[PDB]
Amino acid sequence: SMEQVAMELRLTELTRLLRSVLDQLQDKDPARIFAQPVSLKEVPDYLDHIKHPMDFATMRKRLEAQGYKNLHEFEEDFDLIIDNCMKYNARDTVFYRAAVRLRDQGGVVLRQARREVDSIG
């Protein structure tokens, strides 16, 4: 149908906007602490601690399959990156501190994305 096409164009345009949000968020992680899944070879107990692992590469796979229906879904995944790190790692670690800086900086980017998603529909 023409409506399914129109909806597909909306999803494609969301995907374009989310791809730019994801690039901007990831620049706020220049150390690449959150670039890839925590390695189960290197942290073999990780899944005993963290039930829903997340990282930027896994987000990117989901994005390119147009797997985010709305900004809320995407934000949920970004929040998991941060929140998993702040539970697994102690406050006095380079890891925890990197998450805090990513959260604080990313907040700005996400504040305007929310306005852009509402604005452009």
Phi, psi and omega in degrees: 000163175291324179298318179298317173304311178301319180292317173301324174294317173304313179295320177296318178292324171301315178300319176298314180296317179294324173301321176290318176302315186294320176296318179295323182289317180294332173294338175281010180227063187292336174288351181062030179296327186251009179300323187225161174306139171305127180291123180282341169293312178280332171234075190296336178273005194302318184290345169289334182265311190244117183277333178230084177297150178208157180196168183294324177295322181291321175299315180299320176299316180295320181298314187285341165276016187043044180275357171261114181284334185203165176300325177307314179302317182292311176302324178303315182291317178298317178299324179297319180307307183293309190291326179297314180297318180288344175268312184296318184258146179287156175313321182272035183241154175300327179295306180301314185295325178296319175299317181300318184291319172301314175301311185295312178292320180293330180306322179297315186292314180292329174298320181276326173305318181298320178295317179295324177288319171295307179307296179287355175082000000 
